[PDB]
Every structure is written in structure tokens, then in C-alpha cells.
Amino acid sequence: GADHVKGNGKLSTKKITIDDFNAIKFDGVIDFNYEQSESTPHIEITVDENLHPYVNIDIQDRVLTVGFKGAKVDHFTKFIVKTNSKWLKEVKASGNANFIANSPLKGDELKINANSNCLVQLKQKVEVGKLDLNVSGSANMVVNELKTDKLECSINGSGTINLKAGNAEEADYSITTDGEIMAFGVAVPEVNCKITGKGSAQIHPTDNLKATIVGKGNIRYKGPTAVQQKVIGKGTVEEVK
Structure with missing residues (x-):
């Protein structure tokens, strides 16, 4: 089955473009920083360098979900999300997120x-x-x-x-x-x-x-x-x- 993985303790940041979203959903100890703007949307992820392949960024019907996928993450050092969108109508936050x-x-x-x-x-x-x-x-x-x-x-x-x-x-x-x-x-x-x-x-x-x-x-x-x-x-x- 799914590998159990854990963070190697060395944080790294990756920045990519992101599609349009107007709603956010996430569950877990994630520091999620949002800004409403007309600027080209990007998503910036900070997590243990070996955990970036398991970072899940998925948009369905303009609903953005962020978390992990492809393995069970037993431990991570920190998980920071920095992103923006033109519109925001809903936020669903759970699991001791910020x-x-x-x-x-x-x-x-x-x-x-x-x-x-x-x-x-x-x-x-x-x-x-x-x-x-x-x-x-x-x-x-x-x-x-x-x-x-x-x-x-x-x-x-x-x-x-x-x-x-x-x-x-x-x-x-x-x-x-x-x-x-x-x-x-x-x-x-x-x-x-x-x-x-x-x-x-x-x-x-x-x-x-x-x-x-x-x-x-x-x-x-x-x-x-x-x-x-x-x-x-x-x-x-x-x-x-």
C-alpha cells in the first residue's frame, strides 16, 4: 500500500502558477496565507523538501483543496501556503490550521x-x-x-x-x-x-x-x-x- 513518509527537516519553498478559485478547503496544521487581488494567481508552498511530491493542490468547480496525497505523511516540520485569487466566497478550515x-x-x-x-x-x-x-x-x-x-x-x-x-x-x-x-x-x-x-x-x-x-x-x-x-x-x- 501507500508508503509512510516523514519530513527530512529541511524546509524548501516552491512557487507555481495556480488556476482560478473562489473557495478554499483544507484540513491539517497548515499556515494558509491568502490575499484577494487581480494579480496573476500563484501558489507558494513551504514544506520539508522531500514532501513536495506529496503536496496536493486540486481545484474542482473553482474550489481549491490543499493537503497531502500519494502517501501517509507521519510528520512534517511546517506546511505554509501563500496564494491569491480575484474572488473569495467561502473558506472551510479544520484540524488546527491557521x-x-x-x-x-x-x-x-x-x-x-x-x-x-x-x-x-x-x-x-x-x-x-x-x-x-x-x-x-x-x-x-x-x-x-x-x-x-x-x-x-x-x-x-x-x-x-x-x-x-x-x-x-x-x-x-x-x-x-x-x-x-x-x-x-x-x-x-x-x-x-x-x-x-x-x-x-x-x-x-x-x-x-x-x-x-x-x-x-x-x-x-x-x-x-x-x-x-x-x-x-x-x-x-x-x-x-
Whole structure:
């Protein structure tokens, strides 16, 4: 069967051209550096020199998948991906990967699913019609600045979503089992916030807030805002000054 291989500890970088992609999927301890630009797309891979033949770069229906193929890689020293595309509508990251967007991001929609201990960092302004963020398996997401019409934030099981600054017209915030949403920095006129189980949501509704809690989870908001709530459990909905 497939050979078991391992990195020889000598990192090398290879740069090649890459086809058009608008979606990214990867699973594993990969440092993935992305930029949105009109420049000729390239992909730059850093991995142990003897592992480059096993590096998988595959684009199907504009979905880019990066990982390994052709052998079972028992160990690698580091795995860095640096690439760019004109458009980006989706990112699926898993397995303790680091996804970093080092450019502003634009488009009708941006959907991000961060699972199993990943770290997603959107370091520059995200300006989209709809921003759909999902975290599970203790993954973490940090968004420095956003501007959107519809914002959807959801955490399942565990993990955190930190939305440092920005604006949304409507936001749906949800925490199930456990998790933390840190979004005091995002001003939103219409907010829907729901916690089922444990958790903590920090939010900034500027007109109306619909809050639902079942369990010990807490909703803390900065207003002024009108509030309609339904709480079953020890958790509470409270304003912070």
C-alpha cells in the first residue's frame, strides 16, 4: 500500500502558477496565507523538501483543496501556503490550521466554517453583502473590521468569534452547548441572539434586540436598545455600561 513518509527537516519553498478559485478547503496544521487581488494567481508552498511530491493542490468547480496525497505523511516540520485569487466566497478550515487573510475582502457573500481548533484571522476590512461565520470544535475566529448587510454568527460545541469593529444592518448570533461571541465593537440596528446551554455573547444592538436563553449562558449588550427576551435557566440578559 501507500508508503509512510516523514519530513527530512529541511524546509524548501516552491512557487507555481495556480488556476482560478473562489473557495478554499483544507484540513491539517497548515499556515494558509491568502490575499484577494487581480494579480496573476500563484501558489507558494513551504514544506520539508522531500514532501513536495506529496503536496496536493486540486481545484474542482473553482474550489481549491490543499493537503497531502500519494502517501501517509507521519510528520512534517511546517506546511505554509501563500496564494491569491480575484474572488473569495467561502473558506472551510479544520484540524488546527491557521487561515490568515492579509488583504481586504469584498463580494456578495463570504461564508467561513472553522472547525477542530483552527484559527481564522481576517486582518483587513471585510465588506460583503452577507457574512456567515460558523465555529465548532474549539476553533477561534478574529475579524478586525467588517461592513455587511446581513451578519450570521454561530458557535456549536465550543469556540470563539471575536468581531473587533464594524457595522451590520441585521445580525443573527447563536451559541449552542458553549462558546463566546465578542462583538461589542459591531453596531447593529436589528439583533437576534440565542444561547442554548452555556456561553457568553457580547453584542451591540442599536435599535432592537430579540434574546432567547435556555440554560446558564449570558447575553451582555451595549445599547441604547429595546429588548424582548425569553429566559429559561440561570443565565441572564443584561446591559453593560
